[PDB]
Design a protein around this ligand. Structure first.
Ligand code: GDP
Ligand code: GDP
Ligand code: MG
Ligand code: MG
Lengths: 442, 451
């Protein structure tokens, strides 16, 4: 019973994602050497060129398409502390969508960054994907980030400390601005190609004594990339987060009173708690909690429960309101929210003002796309334009949104089940999205 | 601690699938009156009126393009169960949902209208009643309830004669499909008026109730709701003959040959005499390991390395299906018939087309020998026999022949080994499930000493 970990590999195109990932798979014995060859030969037939290592990540991306997993046993490998699985990487039709719909869900993002001359500079430029990729992971609340500083073999000189330092520094400042805390991220210099420093230290890099993480949960340190992999913190576990319980229904049960029903998404609900309902802003005390027609002292995450509340009318709270704890990040009305969406098969064209209904947790409310803030390439996460005038089917984007009626939502990283939504026009699912920030009301 | 149960509702266009599901939902109190009202008001924009209907309409709509946000609206409670309405025909992703099994059903409620001519349309070779039933059987669903709907509108109103005719006629058809009609409850309802859904109807004094006789114990009832409570849960995969798709096969020093894989069905234990398809090669299992520890049994859903004496690494491979040689041994496959939906492929699939089939851990080029059928993706409606070509958005029935040797099963018998994707370079072009597999004639042995 080692715990399961999900890894997403990101980084700018040609920075070395498939190479590194494939090498790692090879070196960890997840596939037998015979079977590694079948797929090497097979890849060569299929494409012009050599696919040693890379075929692994390429097969993976391709097996995350249209919406069937048939097998993922090749992508599972064992470290000392975890069973790790590679989930997905940028560079295919569905990447953004898999990320956004949670069909591909990750506990950590390995961000590959290329150290070769001009390579790092391209990834981090206006045409590069390094920032976007980091930004995307953060948005999806992947709070564990490892940075693999790759192709060290081909710096100027080979394996330059100075170059490693320069990348660690510049990349640290960006991931800071973005919201990660740099000190928690292992910056590991490596060569995906030769293998340097993936499983043990490399004779080529004697100047490198190792990396140090400092987190809330305590310090850790190592040399290789395997060791970084094993300092990954697990989630954060819903039970330990403040209460969030979106309202499915509200009944008036005779000689008992108002009884809201819902799934505890995060936190504990218990009889006694004085809870708050957003966005109606009403605080009151839970007389009791029922599940399977039986009193509960605790309602845990995943529990569907009735709870009787004193002094509230059935007309005061409704489906889609959100209940939480009044003395622990009580829920609030969303004045507006910023999100990342991928537009699926629409009719035509969307502009500031478009107001479809947003289905989020148990709410169903029309929201205005106030500002269209970025268009984003769905294959790659690459940003393709600031304030685009209009979006259309196939685009990913970043949009600002203003709820038409009062609504309560949460950012996807704080409260996932309250941070993912679908966008709807009649029976049309036009978009799916996740919520970056939310401006709370007063 | 009632187990969870997914229902899908099928039936000819206009049999009353909408009205019945709506009514059931309204009357089981899973949604409160104001919410109902909100979605009733809301539906009244997107024409006279349209009662109970918005319930399915909505559900169908929210089963498009691979996000489900919330499904609390369609869960409801029964004495014995929590039941969710999972999907229904009449929308883009219906057949896909079903084939991919994102929508998987524990039981199918088949609605069947009973007005003059309605039934006969539905049950003709131009009618979806048979096709939906057949579709269900293909997918291993398993349990079937038939709601003989619209009883209020028979001639005369609520005819027992009419109800028996439909029962007799539909039971014959589903016997032909493979279903044991003795096991299927046939409930006369009126989804519109409510008659016989939650409780017996004063309008059907003649109806003394329905009976079913299964392997796993007889039962009887009167209402739809009771019928829902007969549904038996999952066959429980551990009861089945061992199937263990090979992920990898390692040489290990001082032990020999450790195939690794995951038990999909049945049990593996040390000292079993096990066949490997397609290669047809028997042997004994000396060791069974998981998490670096030997195992007494390896259960379904277990990822296990296991040591076999008698066999060199290069005899077996990834793609091979290991099973029990004294309990339905896994044969090789000659050809197999399958149902498939084609997703964004560029060209035009013609007879003899030859892409790779991923299926369990197998990876093998198969030939689209024959193109038996072309099917509507919204509705399951068989649209054409032996079509010249298949394009995007088409479902189909196709005969299939492997290039290399291959072991596959029918979805209904061994699910994890009966659903496949069709891959063409780094593109996924189709997904499907296997109806019939035409096994291999092929003599036992090697039985390599172990006997
Ligand atoms: N010199 C050198 N080349 C590398 C290294 N890693 C990858 N490459 C090459 O850089 C190119 C891009 O690698 P690939 O893994 O395909 O990049 P991806 O698109 O980010 O997956 C390929 O030619 C790789 O062989 C490395 O560490 N050193
Ligand atoms: N008289 C009668 N009419 C019904 C009944 N169930 C449905 N209908 C009507 O028959 C038509 C079929 O409705 P619908 O539920 O949409 O069928 P679906 O297309 O299979 O979902 C509609 O006009 C309904 O009003 C019933 O039990 N009795
Ligand atoms: Mg590349
Ligand atoms: Mg209709």
């Amino acid at each position: 019973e080692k715990t399961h970990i999900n890894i997403v590999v990101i980084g700018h195109v040609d920075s070395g994602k498939s190479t590194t990932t494939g090498h790692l798979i090879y070196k960890c014995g997840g596939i037998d050497k015979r079977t590694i060859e079948k797929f090497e030969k097979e890849a060569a037939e299929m494409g012009k060129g050599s696919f040693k290592y890379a075929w692994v990540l390429d097969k993976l991306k391709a097996e995350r398409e249209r919406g069937i997993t048939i097998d993922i046993s090749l992508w599972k490998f064992e470290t000392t502390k975890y069973y790790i699985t590679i989930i997905d990487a940028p560079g295919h039709r569905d990447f953004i969508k898999n990320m956004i719909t949670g069909t591909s869900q990750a506990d950590c993002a390995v961000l590959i960054v290329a150290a070769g001359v001009g390579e790092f500079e391209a990834g981090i430029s206006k045409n590069g994907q390094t920032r976007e990729h980091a930004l995307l992971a953060y948005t999806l609340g992947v709070k564990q980030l490892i940075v693999g500083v790759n192709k060290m073999d081909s710096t100027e000189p080979a394996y330059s400390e100075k170059r490693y330092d320069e990348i660690v520094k510049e990349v640290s400042a960006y991931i800071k601005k973005i919201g990660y805390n740099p000190a928690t991220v292992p910056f590991v210099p490596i060569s995906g190609w030769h293998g340097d420093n993936m499983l043990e230290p490399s004779p080529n890099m004697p100047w490198f004594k190792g990396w140090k993480v400092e987190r809330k949960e305590g310090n850790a340190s190592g040399v290789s990339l395997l060791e970084a992999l094993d300092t990954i913190l697990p989630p954060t576990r819903p039970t330990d987060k403040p209460l969030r319980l979106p309202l499915q229904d509200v009944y008036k049960i005779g000689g008992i009173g108002t009884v809201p029903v819902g799934r505890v998404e995060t936190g504990i609900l218990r009889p006694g708690m004085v809870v708050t309902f957003a966005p109606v802003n009403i605080t009151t005390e839970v007389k009791s909690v029922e599940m399977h027609h039986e009193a509960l002292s605790e309602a845990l995450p995943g529990d569907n429960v009735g709870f009787n509340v004193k002094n509230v009318s059935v007309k005061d709270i409704r489906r889609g309101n959100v209940c939480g704890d009044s003395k622990s990040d009580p829920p609030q009305e969303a004045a507006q929210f910023t999100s990342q969406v991928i537009i699926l098969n629409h009719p035509g064209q969307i502009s500031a003002g478009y107001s479809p209904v947003i289905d989020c947790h148990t709410a169903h409310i029309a929201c205005k796309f106030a500002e269209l803030k970025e268009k984003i390439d769905r294959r790659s996460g690459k940003k393709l334009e600031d304030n685009p005038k209009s979006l259309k089917s196939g685009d990913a984007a970043i949009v600002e949104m203003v709820p038409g009626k009062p609504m309560c939502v949460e950012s996807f990283s704080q409260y996932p089940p309250l941070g993912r939504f679908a966008v709807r026009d009649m029976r049309q699912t036009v978009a799916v999205g996740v919520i970056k920030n939310v401006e709370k009301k007063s």
